[PDB]
Symmetry: C13
Subunit: 69 residues, 13 copies
Amino acid sequence: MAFLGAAIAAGLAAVAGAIAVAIIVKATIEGTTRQPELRGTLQTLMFIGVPLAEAVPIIAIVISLLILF
Amino acid sequence: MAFLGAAIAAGLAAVAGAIAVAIIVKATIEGTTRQPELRGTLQTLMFIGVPLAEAVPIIAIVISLLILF
Amino acid sequence: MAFLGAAIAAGLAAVAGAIAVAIIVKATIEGTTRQPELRGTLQTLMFIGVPLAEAVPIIAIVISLLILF
Amino acid sequence: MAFLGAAIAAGLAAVAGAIAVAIIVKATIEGTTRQPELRGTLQTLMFIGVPLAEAVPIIAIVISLLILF
Amino acid sequence: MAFLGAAIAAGLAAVAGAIAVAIIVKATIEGTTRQPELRGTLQTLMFIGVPLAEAVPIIAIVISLLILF
Amino acid sequence: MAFLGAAIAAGLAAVAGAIAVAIIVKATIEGTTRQPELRGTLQTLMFIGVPLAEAVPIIAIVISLLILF
Amino acid sequence: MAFLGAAIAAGLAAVAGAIAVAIIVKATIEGTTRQPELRGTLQTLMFIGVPLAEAVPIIAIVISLLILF
Amino acid sequence: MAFLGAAIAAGLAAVAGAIAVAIIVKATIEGTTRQPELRGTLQTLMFIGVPLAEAVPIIAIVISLLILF
Amino acid sequence: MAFLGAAIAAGLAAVAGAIAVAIIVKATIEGTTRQPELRGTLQTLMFIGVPLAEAVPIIAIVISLLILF
Amino acid sequence: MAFLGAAIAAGLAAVAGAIAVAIIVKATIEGTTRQPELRGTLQTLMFIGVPLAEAVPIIAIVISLLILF
Amino acid sequence: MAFLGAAIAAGLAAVAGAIAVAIIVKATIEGTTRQPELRGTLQTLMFIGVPLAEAVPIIAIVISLLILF
Amino acid sequence: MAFLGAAIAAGLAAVAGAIAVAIIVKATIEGTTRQPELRGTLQTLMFIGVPLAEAVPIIAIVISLLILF
Amino acid sequence: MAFLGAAIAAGLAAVAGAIAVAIIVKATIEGTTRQPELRGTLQTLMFIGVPLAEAVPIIAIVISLLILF
Ligand SMILES: CCCCCCCCCCCCO[C@@H]1O[C@H](CO)[C@@H](O[C@H]2O[C@H](CO)[C@@H](O)[C@H](O)[C@H]2O)[C@H](O)[C@H]1O
Ligand SMILES: CCCCCCCCCCCCOP(=O)([O-])OCC[N+](C)(C)C
Ligand SMILES: CCCCCCCCCCCCOP(=O)([O-])OCC[N+](C)(C)C
Ligand SMILES: CCCCCCCCCCCCOP(=O)([O-])OCC[N+](C)(C)C
Ligand SMILES: CCCCCCCCCCCCOP(=O)([O-])OCC[N+](C)(C)C
Ligand SMILES: CCCCCCCCCCCCOP(=O)([O-])OCC[N+](C)(C)C
Ligand SMILES: CCCCCCCCCCCCOP(=O)([O-])OCC[N+](C)(C)C
Ligand SMILES: CCCCCCCCCCCCOP(=O)([O-])OCC[N+](C)(C)C
Ligand SMILES: CCCCCCCCCCCCOP(=O)([O-])OCC[N+](C)(C)C
Ligand SMILES: CCCCCCCCCCCCOP(=O)([O-])OCC[N+](C)(C)C
Ligand SMILES: CCCCCCCCCCCCOP(=O)([O-])OCC[N+](C)(C)C
Ligand SMILES: CCCCCCCCCCCCOP(=O)([O-])OCC[N+](C)(C)C
Ligand SMILES: CCCCCCCCCCCCOP(=O)([O-])OCC[N+](C)(C)C
Ligand SMILES: CCCCCCCCCCCCOP(=O)([O-])OCC[N+](C)(C)C
Ligand code: NA
Ligand code: NA
Ligand code: NA
Ligand code: NA
Ligand code: NA
Ligand code: NA
Ligand code: NA
Ligand code: NA
Ligand code: NA
Ligand code: NA
């Protein structure tokens, strides 16, 4: 029940983080394609957005470990 | 049961927070790409929106920990 | 059974509230992008909409805690 | 089972209400952006629509409480 | 089992009713935006449409109570 | 199991009926917005379409009651 | 397990029938809006399409009762 | 397990058959609206497509009864 | 378990076949509407695609009976 | 469990093959409608794709039989 | 449990392979329709893509057999 | 449970890798269709992307085998 | 349950990682197709975005292995 739990926490975190990052990176690539002169600003939004999106998934990863250990 | 419970809360909190942030950040990137002069304006809305969206997932994270410990 | 319930109430509340906020913020960002002179109007709509959207998820959080304590 | 029941009721009510409100609020923001002169009319519709949308989720929340207590 | 039942009926009725109303309300907001002259006409369709969509969810709420009592 | 059954039948019926009505009413609202002179014509189709869509849901409600009683 | 059976069959039939009719009616309404002259012609297609769509859901209801009785 | 089985096969047959027919009828309605002179040709395609779509669902309905009886 | 199994195979085969036929038929209708001159060509493609699409669902039906008997 | 396994394998293969074929045939119908001159080359593409798409589902059907027998 | 396992692996591999192939082939058909000069180039990409997409599903089929034997 | 596990890991890996490749391949086909001059530039992106997308699915295949052995 | 756990974490991480990469790679291909002169800038974004998206899935695989061992 600890294994099963740790899996669910980690698995959902993976899905959460990957997809969120993908959405953000994709938006960045599309934006940069549309407006190459906005390279920097768009790259900044990506660099701010990604960690924000990963925050809660990262915490869920820690919780997965706490369950396992 | 506490392991499984803690995993469900944290896992759904991860999905919730990550995706919500991605939607907000993507909207900010797209708006910025369309009207670069609004970059500060949209950034401000992102900075307000993200914590608002992360609030409940964060509380579910705390509940996840209360279930575990 | 209590751990499982608390998690389900909290996890669904997280998904509900985060995504609802994201939808509202996204709309505010898109509206402001189209009509920047209306940002104050749109912000007021966002600041009314968000708590209204968070209302039931918050009660579900409370219900989650009542299950645990 | 009272715990699981209370959770399911509260969790679904939360998804139900939050998303319903968000959809209505989004429409209002989109409409107001598109026709700023209609801002009062659309705000009235939002103020009528939100309670209507929340009516059944609220009743579900009460039922959630009746099951828990 | 009665608790679980009452929760499912109430939770689904909530989702059913909330989303149906939001769909209807969103439509009259968009229509009113496109044709402000049809404000009263569209609003009437909203006031006819909502009870109809809420009819079965309400009956499910009653059924939810008959299971609890 | 009768409680579960009555809940599933009533719950699904609610989702079925509410959404179906919403789809029909939205189409009526959208049609009326495009063709204000066809208001009566479209309202008639709505008044014909709603009971047909509700027919099986209300039958599932009866069955929900039969299971409960 | 017969209560569960009668419920699953009735609930699905409800979703099946209600949604199918909604799709057909909405199509009739949209078509009439697009080519009003064809109102009667489309209504006949609606009156033919619905019973055909409701046929198997109706059989499923009969089966639901055969299980319950 | 026969009640449950019969219900699964019948419920899934209902959804399969109803939605398939609705899709074909919607297409016929949409096409008639665009090419009124093709009315008969399109109506014929509907009268061929429906039984073919309904073929397996009907068989599944039979199989449902073989389980129930 | 033979009842459940047979139900799952038959039920999924019904969804598979019915929906696939609906998709193919819809496409034949839309094409015919688009180019009435190709009415027989598209009709041939429909008469070829449907049996191919129904192939595995039919086999699944046979397997369903082999489980039942 | 052999009945459950054979069902799941056959049912899923049914969905897999029927839908894949439908998607390929639909595309063939739309291409032909759009460019009737390419009818031959598109029909060839359909005759290559369909067996390729049905391959693994057919293998899964064999496995379904092995499980049964 | 070996039967159930083999079914899951083979069933999901079927869905994976069929749908992936359908996606790739559909793209090939659409591009060839728009630019018939490239039918050779496009068919080559289709013939490189399909085995790649089928690789892991094929492995899952092998694993399905190892479970069975 | 080792049969179950190995199947889940292989099945999900199959869906992951196949769909991922299909998406990437489709993108390559669409780009090549629009800008044939970029045929080899796009093909390189496909050859970088595919193994990157297959990475984690490959590891999940190994894990599937380790579970069985 | 360790087999179940290790499977769930690996399978979900597979879906997470594969889909995310495919989304980023696709966006890179589309962008490059539209602005070939930005191929280097877009490729860089792909090489930054991919490991960011794979980060949590990779961790979830490590957790998968920690469950197996
Ligand atoms: C019934 C409808 C018939 C429509 C026929 C329309 C013909 C139009 C004129 C033909 C010219 C098209 O030219 C098209 O250009 C691209 C480059 O831009 C070519 O180039 C592509 O294929 C060649 C041949 O393998 C590769 O070496 C090359 O690297 C690749 O980019 C295509 O092979 C060619 O088909
Ligand atoms: C349980 C595992 C299931 C995982 C399912 C993951 C699904 C992820 C879907 C993410 C893809 C969405 O991308 P996006 O950037 O919004 O663009 C699409 C929207 N526009 C076209 C309007 C731009
Ligand atoms: C189980 C986990 C499933 C996760 C599924 C996540 C999918 C989230 C959808 C991705 C975000 C959708 O794009 P968006 O920002 O709304 O804008 C789309 C419209 N425009 C681009 C034109 C503005
Ligand atoms: C298990 C948890 C699953 C969570 C699934 C989350 C999915 C959230 C999807 C929400 C996406 C919101 O897009 P949208 O409002 O349609 O954008 C429309 C933009 N325009 C109006 C300009 C077109
Ligand atoms: C488990 C919980 C799952 C939560 C899933 C949430 C789904 C929310 C989907 C809501 C999507 C937004 O749609 P909408 O704004 O009505 O229309 C789009 C606006 N236009 C009409 C202009 C295009
Ligand atoms: C677990 C339960 C999760 C429930 C999730 C429910 C999500 C329901 C979202 C329904 C939003 C639909 O909006 P709408 O007004 O039809 O616009 C649709 C946009 N177009 C008009 C352009 C098509
Ligand atoms: C578990 C229960 C979850 C319930 C989820 C229900 C989802 C309901 C979505 C309903 C969407 C209704 O959109 P629609 O009027 O067909 O599109 C209109 C598009 N045009 C105007 C362009 C024609
Ligand atoms: C348990 C889950 C139950 C909820 C399921 C709800 C399903 C409703 C899906 C939507 C049904 C109505 O869309 P429709 O008329 O085909 O229009 C779409 C086609 N056009 C936009 C071109 C007109
Ligand atoms: C309870 C589980 C089953 C309930 C799910 C019901 C699903 C109903 C799906 C009906 C929606 C599809 O409609 P349609 O007419 O093909 O238009 C499709 C045209 N577009 C692709 C442009 C939207
Ligand atoms: C129990 C689960 C049952 C789920 C049943 C879901 C059925 C969904 C069927 C959806 C079929 C939609 O495709 P289609 O109308 O061919 O595309 C039409 C696209 N255009 C209009 C632009 C051409
Ligand atoms: C129980 C499980 C049942 C699952 C049933 C799933 C059915 C899914 C059917 C999906 C059909 C997708 O059609 P499509 O032509 O790609 O979209 C329309 C594309 N165009 C706009 C170019 C036309
Ligand atoms: C239980 C198993 C259910 C499987 C359901 C699978 C759904 C069908 C697969 C996805 C079909 C849609 O994607 P696609 O054909 O690449 O693009 C559609 C055409 N556009 C490019 C215009 C969007
Ligand atoms: C267990 C059941 C699994 C079912 C999995 C179904 C997967 C369906 C994936 C469908 C992915 C479709 O995305 P896409 O074609 O890249 O975008 C379409 C838009 N454009 C190409 C125009 C840009
Ligand atoms: C376990 C089941 C797994 C199902 C996974 C389904 C994956 C579908 C992900 C792809 C869905 C959306 O595609 P996309 O690339 O964002 O295109 C959006 C169109 N533009 C690129 C033009 C913006
Ligand atoms: Na974007
Ligand atoms: Na946006
Ligand atoms: Na908006
Ligand atoms: Na709107
Ligand atoms: Na509307
Ligand atoms: Na229509
Ligand atoms: Na059509
Ligand atoms: Na394509
Ligand atoms: Na593409
Ligand atoms: Na893109």
